[PDB]
A paper describes a structure:
When conducting Ala substitution to investigate the role of the substrate-binding residues in our previous study, we found that substituting S523, a residue that binds the carboxyl group of the substrate, to Ala leads to 2.5-fold increase in 5-Br-Trp production and very low di-brominated product. Before conducting engineering, the crystal structure of [name]-[name] in complex with Trp was resolved (**[Table tbl1]**). The binding pose and the interaction network of Trp to the enzyme are identical to those of the wild type enzyme (**[Fig fig1]**). This indicates that removing S523-mediated polar interaction poses minimal influence to the binding of Trp. This also indicates that the S523-mediated interaction is crucial to the binding of 5-Br-Trp, such that the Ala substitute is incapable of accepting the substrate that shows a flipped pose relative to Trp and displays low dibrominated Trp production activity as previously proposed. [name]-[name], a variant that was identified in our previous study, exhibits around 3.9 % activity to produce di-brominate Trp compared with the wild type enzyme.
The first documented single-component Trp-FDH is [name] from cyanobacterium *[name]*, which catalyzes consecutively bromination on C5 and then C7 of Trp to generate 5,7-di-Br-Trp. More recently, a class of “single-component” FDHs has been identified. These enzymes fuse pyridine nucleotide-dependent flavin reductase and FDH on the same polypeptide chain, an advantageous feature in the application aspect relative to canonical FDHs owing to the omission of including a flavin reductase. The action of FDHs requires the reduced flavin and molecular oxygen to generate hydroperoxyl flavin intermediate, which oxidizes a halide ion to form a halogenating reagent hypohalous acid (HOX). The flipping allows the carbon-to-be-halogenated to be oriented toward the catalytic residue K258 and within the hydrogen bond distance to the putative general base E200, such that the halogenation site on two substrates is switched from C5 to C7.
Numbering used by the authors: 1 to 579, 585 to 612, 631 to 653
């Protein structure tokens, strides 16, 4: 009887296959001849874009230990080349066929295929990814479209990439949406670049709910009155968050687009622009699009005629070339039959950690948990360890399964509360999920085992990337010691992030929101850093057109668009003329922290002074309990 069948092999399955090979666990992979969207994109020469996620969060530990030198955003080409390199390693273990049906029995499954070949396996892992409406726009994308009006009903990373590609052809862009959360993918800390995933310090949730809520939520929830922030200048960007019924923030189910702010884009790419564009570094600054009117927001119920293909806004009846109905992702699951008869019904919340379904025996889901920020790699690497342990260690399998239903209820209570299921329930803060799995497996760190201030920075401020949990113990990867060292040396041991928590520990939510926006450049959607880059934008558009052999007349003036922008930007044309604690507090804080790096915590003196009380309390956080684990 085959011990393990893995169904689907692209990106998610890679770390699990690595661990099964290491422990010489008998396994077979079944994966479609057709491959993935990355194959559609490769074949048709449209791997001409870049990830919305950092190298550190997007490649697996066992690659980073070799290949990490600096933080950067990988290209689509680099991500695909890495899939292909791992496929080549394991191709002999891959049967090229398509699973049509799985019949699940008490201790095995029967797997049916398009060819007709059937397989029996004790343990079955699904790593088949998602179907996505929007993939055709990307894979079949036509750039000879010019001066046309596009209407999007949803903002997501796919819409943002499409928009990035349309705008340089003077395509006009209308978003008819119920608001969206956009976040600069790279930010300044005292004029050094940090990818946003570097600044989440998620284990601060263990100090308290309320404290972590203040570290994180002012850029998302409409909390500051600062007229510089995109959600004040363009309030149609705001959302109905009335659904949120959890003290865990950011909540499970929050999705965000990560985008290049034009100032950071300029800093990286100004000096070899055309070459950086051809590599896939595309300017996708939605905030700059709103600023410049290249995109407009209209209310969610701005009526439109689908027969005449018209949107009417103010007094112009705008004909549109295309309505984009907005991305929805659904797992590519074959039919699964409970005791080989009753269709399994898939729902994220009814699975433990997005991995273990109820009423199935020895079936696991790998790659169906989506990270709020950072790459999928963080999520699938930890899921792969979790699955590997469940398959290979009956003691662990029994420990998790014995109370599976209670664990799932306690997880759902903690992260969703009373909210009804939503299509984005599968979206999680990466540094809660990785930590959650680490504590289930037992490869977590204990806060009480911190000895020095250096140790508290590593526990609380060092990002919860999967490789954090592969330094020592059961899943240790060779070279993680040197990788952690490089990362720490290049980011001042995450002292800046740590002193953010020190600065706001005494503030209420309104005070922390004001302080967040008191910077010369606050982290996200700072509309003061847009006007200065108008000339660079024109250089960018001409560089984009040069790389993609486009010609269009800006001497040709779409006078109708110019008119609808005015109407859309009315709140902005009032709010912006009304336009630095954080910078100074962080500057002072870092100096203090970097000065006591190697000081013993437990022995730090009594009697700032209460910032020492606080630092000593970090050995005994009071919100450490997670009832789906204990
Ligand atoms: C446009 C785009 C951009 C993305 N950008 C990023 C990014 O910036 N950062 C990031 O971290 N992630 C990104 N992702 C998400 C994620 O990394 C990809 O979706 C990735 O391909 C997921 O890998 P996977 O292995 O889960 O699924 P896939 O890569 O889709 O591989 C699954 C494989 O299973 C096969 N298969 C499916 N069903 C069956 C079956 N029944 N039988 C046999 N074989 C089957 C498929 O043919 C496929 O080859 C992006 C996704 C898309 C679409
Ligand atoms: N804590 C950092 C970074 C940050 C806040 N909210 C976020 C949401 C997602 C990612 C990063 C962040 C800050 O206050 O600026
Ligand atoms: N185009 C993809 C992007 C994506 C999916 N999952 C991700 C995880 C991390 C980063 C990007 C993604 C989508 O939004 O459907």
């Amino acid at each position: 009887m085959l011990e393990v069948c893995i169904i689907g092999f692209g990106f998610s399955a890679i770390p699990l296959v690595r661990e099964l090979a290491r422990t010489q666990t008998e396994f077979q992979i079944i994966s479609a001849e057709s491959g993935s969207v990355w194959d559609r994109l490769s074949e048709s020469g449209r791997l001409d874009f870049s990830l919305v996620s950092s190298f550190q969060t997007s490649f697996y530990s066992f690659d980073l230990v070799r290949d990490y030198e600096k933080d950067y955003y990988p290209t689509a080409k680099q991500f695909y080349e890495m899939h292909e390199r791992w496929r080549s390693v394991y191709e002999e273990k891959i049967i090229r066929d398509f699973v049509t049906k799985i019949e699940n029995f008490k201790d095995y499954s029967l797997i049916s295929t398009r060819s007709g070949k059937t397989y029996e396996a004790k343990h079955v892992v699904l790593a088949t990814g998602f179907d996505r409406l929007m993939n055709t726009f990307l894979s079949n994308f036509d750039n000879h479209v010019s001066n046309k009006t596009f209407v999007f009903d949803t903002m997501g990373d796919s819409a943002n990439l499409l928009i990035a590609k349309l705008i340089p052809n003077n395509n006009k862009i209308i978003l008819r949406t119920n608001g969206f959360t956009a976040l600069d993918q790279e930010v300044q800390v005292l004029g050094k670049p940090f990818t946003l995933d570097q600044l989440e310090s998620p284990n601060f949730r263990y100090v308290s709910s309320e404290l972590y809520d203040r570290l994180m939520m002012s850029p998302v929830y409409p909390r500051t009155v600062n007229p510089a922030v995109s959600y004040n200048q363009f309030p149609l960007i705001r959302r109905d968050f009335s659904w949120v019924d959890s003290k865990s923030s950011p909540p499970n189910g929050l999705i965000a687009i990560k985008y290049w702010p034009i100032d950071q884009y300029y800093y990286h790419f100004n000096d070899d622009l055309e070459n950086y564009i051809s590599k896939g570094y595309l300017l996708n600054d939605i905030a700059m699009w709103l600023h410049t009117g290249k995109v407009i927001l209209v209310p969610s119920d701005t009526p439109i005629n689908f027969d005449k293909k018209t949107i009417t806004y103010a007094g112009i009846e705008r004909s549109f070339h295309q309505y984009v109905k907005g991305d929805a992702e659904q797992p590519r699951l074959p039919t699964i039959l409970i005791n080989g008869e009753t269709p399994f019904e898939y729902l994220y919340r009814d699975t433990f950690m997005g991995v273990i379904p109820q009423r199935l025996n020895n079936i696991y889901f790998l790659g169906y948990t989506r990270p709020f920020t950072g790459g999928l790699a963080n999520i699938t690497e930890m899921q792969s360890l979790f699955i590997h342990k469940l398959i290979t260690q009956p003691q662990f399998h029994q420990k998790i399964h014995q109370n599976l239903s209670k664990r799932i209820t306690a997880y759902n209570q903690h992260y969703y509360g009373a909210a009804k299921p939503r299509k984005h329930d599968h979206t999680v803060p990466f540094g809660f999920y990785t930590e959650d799995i680490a504590r289930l497996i037992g490869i977590h760190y204990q806060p009480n085992e911190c000895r020095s201030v250096r140790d508290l920075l590593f526990y609380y401020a060092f990002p919860n990337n999967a490789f954090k949990y592969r330094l020592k113990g059961e899943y240790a990867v060779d070279g993680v010691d040197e990788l952690i060292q490089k990362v720490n040396d290049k980011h001042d041991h995450y002292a800046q992030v740590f002193v953010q928590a020190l600065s706001i520990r005494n503030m209420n939510s309104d005070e922390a929101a004001e302080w967040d926006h008191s910077a010369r450049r606050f982290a996200f959607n700072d509309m003061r850093h847009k006007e200065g880059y108008r000339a660079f934008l024109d250089t960018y558009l001409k560089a984009y057109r040069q790389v993609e052999n486009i010609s269009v007349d800006d001497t040709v003036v779409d006078e109708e668009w110019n008119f609808m922008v005015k109407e859309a930007c009315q709140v902005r044309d009032k709010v912006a003329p009304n336009i630095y604690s954080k910078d100074e507090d962080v500057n002072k804080g870092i100096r203090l922290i970097l000065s006591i790096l190697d000081s013993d915590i437990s022995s730090l003196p009594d009697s700032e002074a209460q910032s020492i009380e606080f630092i000593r309390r970090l050995l005994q956080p009071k919100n450490y309990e997670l009832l789906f684990i204990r």
